[PDB]
Design a protein around this nucleic acid. Structure first.
Ligand code: MG
Ligand code: MG
Ligand code: MG
Ligand code: MG
Ligand code: MG
Ligand code: MG
Ligand code: MG
Ligand code: MG
Ligand code: MG
Ligand code: MG
Ligand code: MG
Ligand code: MG
Ligand code: MG
Ligand code: MG
Ligand code: MG
Ligand code: MG
Ligand code: MG
Ligand code: MG
Ligand code: MG
Ligand code: MG
Ligand code: MG
Ligand code: MG
Ligand code: MG
Ligand code: MG
Ligand code: MG
Ligand code: MG
Ligand code: MG
Ligand code: MG
Ligand code: MG
Ligand code: MG
Ligand code: MG
Ligand code: MG
Ligand code: MG
Ligand code: MG
Ligand code: MG
Ligand code: MG
Ligand code: MG
Ligand code: MG
Ligand code: MG
Ligand code: MG
Ligand code: MG
Ligand code: MG
Ligand code: MG
Ligand code: MG
Ligand code: MG
Ligand code: MG
Ligand code: MG
Ligand code: MG
Ligand code: MG
Ligand code: MG
Ligand code: MG
Ligand code: MG
Ligand code: ZN
Lengths: 65, 88, 275, 115, 96
RNA sequence: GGGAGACUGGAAUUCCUGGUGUAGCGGUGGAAUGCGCAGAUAUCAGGAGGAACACCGGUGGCGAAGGCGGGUCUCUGGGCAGUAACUGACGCUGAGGAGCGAAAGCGUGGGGAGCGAACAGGAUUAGAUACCCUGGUAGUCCACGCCGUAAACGGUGGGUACUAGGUGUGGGUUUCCUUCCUUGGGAUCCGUGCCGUAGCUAACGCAUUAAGUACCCCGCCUGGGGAGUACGGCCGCAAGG
């Protein structure tokens, strides 16, 4: 298990706006991976989940293309 | 839920002094304002059983506090019940 | 809402009514009343045109602004939502700014105090009549007309009214209560919102006096009819007629819709029931 | 007729596999199935039946005159790789492979369990 | 009097210049009612993930709003009624 | 993911419409009832409608318990840490009583894509009124009422005080190697998994989230059938409880 990046206070804030942090965590098919793979944190990936799925709803990331 | 402005207004305006906050008078005042406000809300929202649980809990809590006030002093109990205009 | 009546008498045991708590005035405007009478189910010629109806309780008539087009750009507050029995729905009088009061169909959930506009600038609160140029596709509509300015005829059922589907070219598509789609001009007049008295379907009739009052006559079953009077007539005992049911007027069950109407080309398909 | 580029559509079930060759616009040219090949029952579910269906589709498409195709695959695995290998070896060149399998978002309700 | 985040997507048939007058006219109702503060930034012409309303592209506009829930609901009702808009939403900038 | 109302999104199934496209498509251990040659299957374009939210999603969170998860808004409950300002015996459990409550079932009025009791055929067997296949009526959805039962399980009522640890997770306060990035190290309280002492238990086993050692109150049991049944009483329109 690797480091959870967003528990850093120097890390950027998590939101639906930053498509770079959005698509660094989504698969080429268009899917969100597991904690076991990513090494990241739980409330953290809850924040990513809400942000990225909100972006997907506002049609910023594909629906499993 | 009450917020800072009206809640401090109530605690001061029914407070015995300008500093006390946990007095039974202020406690009953907060409980009564909460129950009327959220009962007005539930007059619109019918099937909120999880909130009717809050109704019943706060009401039983209120009943315990009113019983304590009546036990400790009849005069203060009568003054409180008359100033709020309730039945018991 | 709905109030059920207690069984004081064996007759009114089941009678339940929709109590009209939505009433504000009791004596209708005397200026707008026109002379009317129960026709008794008969034409001026004297023959009974349609049986099972006629007689009853003589009632008055009042002009409803079904086709509201003459005055636009002026607001109107809901004067008084009164009760007109000549319709399933209710009529709510309006004080228009010019002082000319007309009755209109009262939509669902209308109470005294709302401001109603009739024209292009009208908003989406119910009671606003406006052509399809100024309405979103998908909104529930009622009192729908058929041409730009010839008087509105359809979509006045209490509780379920026509729903707009979409606009293409110069023709607009309307969804029927039956589940059907009708092609209509994009410039016809239509209102927004369902019509009130949705609980009226929960009315329980109650007895025969109410019904002679309402207008209908008792129904005479064909199986006891006389054979000369009816194809189901005759028999010693209870018999169904020995053949499929037929109106005694000659034709049995089946197609009755004569095609080739001018709006037949303006219909996509016919109603299908029980799906 | 004639067409420069085509599209190959393959679907495989637990008991069947059918192949159709279509234009990128969706205009089909030819279709082939193991049932049309001549297998009956579960004999139709075999990968060799997929081979025969693929070669029949490839031949019937090459009289029509298609050179370049892309393959779309869907359905549970019975013979994906074997079928695409047969299609490639039949003389056609594949550009891209894409797996577009219909997946519901808990839409409707799946049938009862098998016992 | 709570900070709100709103994003509006418009049909690409409208040019980039008209967006600013349209948005300021839309939010004048909140400007004139609650005495509010706003911030506007613009970026458009991005390739959409899929077809929406049979369209392939659009323009994005994000506004930070400090206003009344009644005012923001009124803006939502007035704006989603428009045909040139495609998709919109409102969120809370604060904890909740 | 605590609850309620409203708005909204995509994928999928089915159906309809229009191309293309040919003799099969669906099915199981094998085959036939099923739909096609009136143009099926397949595939592209469009539309319609109903249900439910795959990934995140876990032996994780919340709720008193049933249970709860597509987003957005609106209003609201409960719980947790620190300062400890104030009330100064207000605490606990609670017979009878009252409120909530899985699914199925009932009335009224709507909805009804998929799924699916009942019922038809096809199949196996000496025999199938089942397991299997093709169809599909209630129901499954919505609103208002109802019945109030589940292996409603942690098969363990709640509250309080005390009694060795180790290993994960979540939430919040602090301090120190200090980059002061770091599941770095330490202190603290709450929740939730696993293994284990002493101890208890007939055994399996529990083991600070006790079945350990006690205190307070409440319900329940006194061999198996008869029987959770008859009568009587109460509730429910009835099924019934
Ligand atoms: Mg967070
Ligand atoms: Mg709160
Ligand atoms: Mg009766
Ligand atoms: Mg008259
Ligand atoms: Mg004559
Ligand atoms: Mg009649
Ligand atoms: Mg007379
Ligand atoms: Mg009436
Ligand atoms: Mg009769
Ligand atoms: Mg007779
Ligand atoms: Mg005759
Ligand atoms: Mg005669
Ligand atoms: Mg007779
Ligand atoms: Mg006889
Ligand atoms: Mg007949
Ligand atoms: Mg119809
Ligand atoms: Mg199989
Ligand atoms: Mg199956
Ligand atoms: Mg509700
Ligand atoms: Mg077609
Ligand atoms: Mg199709
Ligand atoms: Mg349907
Ligand atoms: Mg002190
Ligand atoms: Mg307590
Ligand atoms: Mg007690
Ligand atoms: Mg007690
Ligand atoms: Mg008791
Ligand atoms: Mg009791
Ligand atoms: Mg009750
Ligand atoms: Mg009750
Ligand atoms: Mg159910
Ligand atoms: Mg149920
Ligand atoms: Mg029944
Ligand atoms: Mg019912
Ligand atoms: Mg019904
Ligand atoms: Mg079925
Ligand atoms: Mg079955
Ligand atoms: Mg039959
Ligand atoms: Mg059978
Ligand atoms: Mg029990
Ligand atoms: Mg349970
Ligand atoms: Mg218990
Ligand atoms: Mg205890
Ligand atoms: Mg602890
Ligand atoms: Mg020991
Ligand atoms: Mg022992
Ligand atoms: Mg242990
Ligand atoms: Mg314990
Ligand atoms: Mg014990
Ligand atoms: Mg027995
Ligand atoms: Mg017994
Ligand atoms: Mg009895
Ligand atoms: Zn983290």
């Amino acid at each position: 298990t690797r480091k959870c990046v967003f528990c850093s206070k120097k890390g950027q804030t998590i939101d639906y706006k930053d498509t770079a942090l959005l698509r660094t965590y989504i698969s080429e098919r268009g899917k969100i991976r597991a904690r076991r793979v990513t090494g990241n944190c739980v409330q953290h990936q809850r924040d990513i989940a809400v942000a990225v799925k909100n972006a997907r709803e506002v049609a910023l990331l594909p629906f499993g293309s | 839920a009450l917020t800072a402005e009206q809640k401090k207004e109530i605690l001061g305006q029914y407070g015995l002094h300008d500093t006390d906050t946990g007095s039974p008078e202020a406690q009953v005042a907060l409980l009564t304002k909460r129950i009327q406000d959220l009962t007005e809300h539930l007059k619109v929202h019918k099937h909120d059983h999880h909130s009717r649980r809050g109704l019943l809990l706060l009401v039983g809590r209120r009943r315990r506090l009113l019983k304590y006030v009546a036990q400790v002093d009849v005069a203060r109990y009568r003054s409180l019940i008359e100033r709020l205009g309730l039945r018991r | 809402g709905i109030r059920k009546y207690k069984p004081t008498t064996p007759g009114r045991r089941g009678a339940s009514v929709s109590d009209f708590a939505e009433i504000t005035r009791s004596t209708p405007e005397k200026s707008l009343v026109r002379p009317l009478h129960g026709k008794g189910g008969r034409n001026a010629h004297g023959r009974i045109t349609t049986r099972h109806k006629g007689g009853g309780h003589k009632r008055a008539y009042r002009v409803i602004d079904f086709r509201r087009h003459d005055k636009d750009g002026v607001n109107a507050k809901v004067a008084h939502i009164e009760y007109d029995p000549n319709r399933t729905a209710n009529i709510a009088l309006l004080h228009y700014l010019d002082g000319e009061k007309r009755y209109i169909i009262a939509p669902q959930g209308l109470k005294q105090g709302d401001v109603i506009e009739s024209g292009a600038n009208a908003d989406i609160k119910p009671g606003n009549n406006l052509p399809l140029r100024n309405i979103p596709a998908g909104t529930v509509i009622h009192a729908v007309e058929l041409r730009p300015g010839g008087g509105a005829k359809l979509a006045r059922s209490a509780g379920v009214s026509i729903q707009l589907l979409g606009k293409e070219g110069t023709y607009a598509a309307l969804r029927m209560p039956s589940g059907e789609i009708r092609r209509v001009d994009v410039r016809c007049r239509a209102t927004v919102g369902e019509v009130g008295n949705a609980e009226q379907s929960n009315i329980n009739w109650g007895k025969a006096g109410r019904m002679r009052w309402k207008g209908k006559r008792p129904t005479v079953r064909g199986v006891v009819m006389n054979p000369v009077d009816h194809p189901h007539g005759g028999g010693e005992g209870k018999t169904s007629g020995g053949r499929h049911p037929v109106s005694p007027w000659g034709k049995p069950e089946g197609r009755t819709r004569k095609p080739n109407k001018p709006s037949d080309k303006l219909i996509v398909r016919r109603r299908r029931t029980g799906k | 007729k004639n067409v420069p580029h085509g599209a190959a559509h393959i679907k495989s079930t637990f008991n069947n596999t059918i192949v159709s060759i279509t234009d990128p616009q969706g205009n089909v040219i030819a279709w082939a199935s193991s049932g049309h090949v001549g297998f009956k029952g579960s004999r139709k579910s075999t990968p060799f039946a997929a081979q025969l269906a693929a070669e029949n589709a490839a031949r019937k498409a090459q009289e029509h005159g298609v050179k370049k195709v892309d393959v779309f695959v869907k359905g549970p695995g019975s013979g994906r790789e074997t079928a695409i290998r047969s299609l490639q070896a039949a003389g056609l060149e594949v550009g891209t492979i894409s797996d577009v399998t219909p997946q519901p978002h808990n839409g409707c309700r799946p049938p009862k369990r098998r016992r | 009097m709570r900070p709100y985040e709103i994003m509006v997507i418009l049909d690409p048939t409208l040019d980039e210049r008209t967006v600013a007058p349209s948005l300021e006219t839309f939010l004048n109702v909140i400007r004139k009612d609650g005495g509010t503060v706003d911030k506007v930034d613009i970026w458009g012409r991005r390739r959409l993930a899929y077809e929406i309303a049979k369209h392939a592209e659009g323009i994005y506009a994000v506004i930070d709003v400090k206003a009344e829930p009644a005012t923001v609901s009124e803006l939502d009702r007035q704006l989603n009624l428009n045909e040139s808009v495609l998709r919109t939403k409102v969120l809370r900038t604060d904890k909740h």
